[PDB]
Design a protein around this ligand. Sequence first.
Ligand code: NAP
Ligand code: SF4
Ligand code: SF4
Ligand code: SF4
Lengths: 147, 75, 88, 296, 106, 111, 206, 176
Amino acid sequence: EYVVAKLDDLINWARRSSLWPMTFGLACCAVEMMHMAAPRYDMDRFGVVFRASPRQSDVMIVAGTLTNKMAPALRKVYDQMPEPRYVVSMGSCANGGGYYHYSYSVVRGCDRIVPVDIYVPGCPPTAEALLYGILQLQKKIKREKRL
Amino acid sequence: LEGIKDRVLYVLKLYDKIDPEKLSVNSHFMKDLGLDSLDQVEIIMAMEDEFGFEIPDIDAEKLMCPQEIVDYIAD
Amino acid sequence: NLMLALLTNFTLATLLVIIAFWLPQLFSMKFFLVAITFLLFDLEIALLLPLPWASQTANLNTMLTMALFLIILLAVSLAYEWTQKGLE
Amino acid sequence: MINILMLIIPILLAVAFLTLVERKVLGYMQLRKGPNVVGPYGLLQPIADAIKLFIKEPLRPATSSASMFILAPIMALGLALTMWIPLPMPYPLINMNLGVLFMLAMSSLAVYSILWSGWASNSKYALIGALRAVAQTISYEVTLAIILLSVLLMSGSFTLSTLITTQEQMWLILPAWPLAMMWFISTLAETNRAPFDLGPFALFFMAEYANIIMMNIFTAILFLGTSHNPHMPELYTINFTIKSLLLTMSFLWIRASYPRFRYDQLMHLLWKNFLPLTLALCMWHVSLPILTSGIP
Amino acid sequence: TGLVGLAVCETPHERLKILYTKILDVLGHIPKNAAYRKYTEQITNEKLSMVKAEPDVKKLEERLQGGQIEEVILQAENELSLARKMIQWKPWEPLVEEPPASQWKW
Amino acid sequence: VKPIFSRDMNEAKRRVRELYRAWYREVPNTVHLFQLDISVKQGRDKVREMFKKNAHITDPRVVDLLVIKGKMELEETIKVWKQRTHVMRFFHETEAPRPKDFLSKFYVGHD
Amino acid sequence: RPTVRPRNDVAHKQLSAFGEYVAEILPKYVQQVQVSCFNELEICIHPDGVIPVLTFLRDHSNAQFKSLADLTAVDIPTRQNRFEIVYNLLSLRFNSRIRVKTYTDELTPIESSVPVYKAANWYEREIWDMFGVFFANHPDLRRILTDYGFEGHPFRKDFPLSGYVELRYDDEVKRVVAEPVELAQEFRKFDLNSPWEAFPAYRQPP
Amino acid sequence: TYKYVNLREPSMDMKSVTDRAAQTLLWTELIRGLGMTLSYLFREPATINYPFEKGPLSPRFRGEHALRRYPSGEERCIACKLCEAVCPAQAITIEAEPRADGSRRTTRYDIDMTKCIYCGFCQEACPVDAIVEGPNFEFSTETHEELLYNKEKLLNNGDKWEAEIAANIQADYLYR
Ligand SMILES: NC(=O)c1ccc[n+]([C@@H]2O[C@H](COP(=O)([O-])OP(=O)(O)OC[C@H]3O[C@@H](n4cnc5c(N)ncnc54)[C@H](OP(=O)(O)O)[C@@H]3O)[C@@H](O)[C@H]2O)c1
Ligand code: SF4
Ligand code: SF4
Ligand code: SF4
């Protein structure tokens, strides 16, 4: 009864410890995503590892703008991901097309392709604000599989 | 050529959007059978693969009847 | 025992595979020339392997001329690899 | 026979606790902070990676060909752990009749671990890159056998216990000056990802990092020694660990400091350039016990 | 000494003189009434006089080029191709093509 | 004449015929190499309905431009290009689809 | 003027010499209209011969341009002839910028600039993409900035900014990404156009 | 201007050839390259852990939108559609109605965070200084609906940041 409730938090602590994100270089946002590696603002080995890889990674960060050419391309990456997967839409383009939006080529929302759990609103998403996205992800993991 | 009309008629009758008994020998595919400008010539392309010979664009315009197609098939 | 030591490592290695498997529920022929040369050199290594363990009872003067001889021809085989090997 | 379990369980912990060293020591090289949030200094993270990948992380195979893919990690982990048995240490577990021949044999069979993984995927897209990764390991094993023999021909038989006794006053780095430089480079070819780089996927990490410690220890036997002392096992145990740890820092040094050498020019460093150099030193090491009396 | 470009800096004089004398004859084959022949000839004759007066001096190369003889030789090499294309396709000699529709202002 | 385009009146019609054969041979090939999707027979029916909308022919200038476009959107399969059953799919999968009637469209109320 | 004026005209008369020099050849085949304003030169060219104009300025004894670098196109529906392909050319030895324009409607094919300039073929693909202008005797005419399953030409002023196929759902089908859905959010059409004429001399009599 | 990247044969004869050969025979420069990271390891790293330490900023910084008000009550936004037309993303929407009797200040006021590329243009175009960009980082949602700002309300809830905004605007009048 007591052991059942405490063991569930231990599995959730494993994802609270480390999260491996996908390095998508599809944006100006991606340069701010490279500022996560930049020593001044770091989640590197605090949780984030820049090894990425399409299969081994648990998190995938959709960096900024997505076109109709990349719409089938990013979808097949999501299928290759393991079952505990979290998608962060870092940047205003990823949230619903910050710029462009009404344009012909840019896909609105990202959720029309891949479902999003954590939204980051910032165009140049400041590394200070980017640190919230990973910290909120760790906080959001509370309870998984009761029965 | 001997035994050429039998090989072409078997493939033409088996194909879709064509009458099995109403249209056979001498009758034109575009005039007598009842087919479109692109649809009639498309049936001739399927017969070329079965026989084992490539047909040019210039010779395809003149040919329409299976009796006329048998003479063009010989090389 | 060597048999007891070897089998303990493999049986624990098999058990680690089952943990991940059972618990959760919800072209170019230029590569070939490199591979062949590996085999042909290692056989010359196999002939040159006994050297530290062999040279204990046998005469040194008879061995010296023969021991270097295998290494010389092992360099001649590499000298044939300089006369156009390829883009690799 | 309980000592075998006392050479797998603390060894699996050593591969686990590498994750701290592999990104904190590498971290200060890159002026970044490594593990800090998870533990007091991040000591809770290495064991946390095990709970993440083993239990909860599920499988999605490409084709799963009956026996394979669920056999390749057994060959990967099994061959990496069996390499610990012939090791001389202060005292070896079940000492072989010939030492270094067992060491070279299980490393040459460790090539299969990256071979069966290439056969696991049905696609042609993966196997071309997989064979390229085999070429990185298979080529350097030619020279690895040569540089081994030159050290052995200087002093001692194949037995690893005799290699400690021959290093009584001075290290083997000084007589084998160009040969010691070779062992810094040649060992990095076996999936270290410093000169060249290519559930069950997590098990490969536990096997590949295990070989990194293995090459660090094996270099500290062939070239390092300082003292033996049979009466005092206390003095040898502490002094051996510090020497091996300094070589572990140099393994992570190449990973951070230096870019990849290209696959084509990896075959220009070796074969074109290293193989004429190693054999010329091998020619020199044949003459050494004949020129001056040096036979075990 | 070598030029920065891919074209090799070869010590060759009168090489510029041959190519500049060759192009003058090609211009006097088909166009005669056209202004293309009348204007290009007087520039080439002005340049040829500088080569004859100055013997292998860097100041001669500095005149209307200032990137050594290798850059000036490239200007003569494509001059024969430009003259032959102008002789083949009539444009300079004949003018009879239709005028555009009356619109220009945005 | 002006402007050239590629062919003059009658020659433009036979360029469509050459284009039709090249695309007819690819629809059986784009099942095993690509994906099963729907059907081989249904894929060939998608060809005929595409050319019916294009069937007008008043000037060779319009016809010639359709050949160049026809050797591009239907070429997106021959030389092996990435689509992943999303690009080059012409038929609507999620279409309602609407009908043209004064009883069907007026009941839903549109425009 | 101290802050009001950018630069005084001094090289304007020097650049006007080019407006005479090329016009001294006087082809109806090539020349037509020569416009020069704000230290820049603009030439428009008759559709029949574009390649002979591009072989000129390349090499040449008087002026050496060589680089026919940047290539644009103008969409305008006011004229009877629609499109206007604009070449931007730069000289390294001479240090000057000249412009080459085309006046034709070019729904009918136009002559390619590939044999004269190597990088021109990549720009020629963009004009066929955005505007829909075919280049005759062109090697490899492939779509770059447009989608693989895209209908029409994305830039033309005849159709809206949102388009016809733009929204891509996933929903019911397991793998197939949707296309036929057309609805998007409302782009607010601004009617901001100031009363009174902005500048004198630019006014044309009806 | 010319600077030249080419060395043009560093080795000539005997002494200059041997040292250029020594770096290729063994390593030397790799050991010299090893020493670059060696001293770089010892010097203190500049690292900021976010839940405790905070990074450097400025008096003028743009984050999440919040509309300010007068010291004695009253909404500062006057409803112009000025900021609506300047907005390059068209994130801001405004529909205005008369407030009870006399006063005419807003009704509909939605700023999309699905849009908005963050310019400070709406801060600049505003004559009354209603939208002032406050030092904000914390914004994370589960849905688009929770992310896009409603009819003022949540924008008026920027009172928690308006104390900082009032301090920041004191460094803004007569710019810096
Ligand atoms: N092909 C067929 O099998 C077939 C044939 C003929 C008719 N049908 C009909 O079609 C339907 C198919 O549905 P399905 O079997 O695909 O559904 P399902 O996979 O069983 O999914 C139902 C979901 O609802 C939740 N749920 C249902 N009852 C619950 C309860 N009492 N307490 C808590 N959670 C509950 C479950 O969550 P948890 O897992 O978290 O509890 C489960 O994820 C059936 O209702 C059947 O009548 C099916
Ligand atoms: S949100 Fe801003 S920074 Fe990010 S991709 Fe879009 S425009 Fe670039
Ligand atoms: S925010 Fe300022 S500019 Fe915009 S409507 Fe309100 S008062 Fe006018
Ligand atoms: S910051 Fe720019 S994009 Fe955002 S609401 Fe203001 S004007 Fe619009």
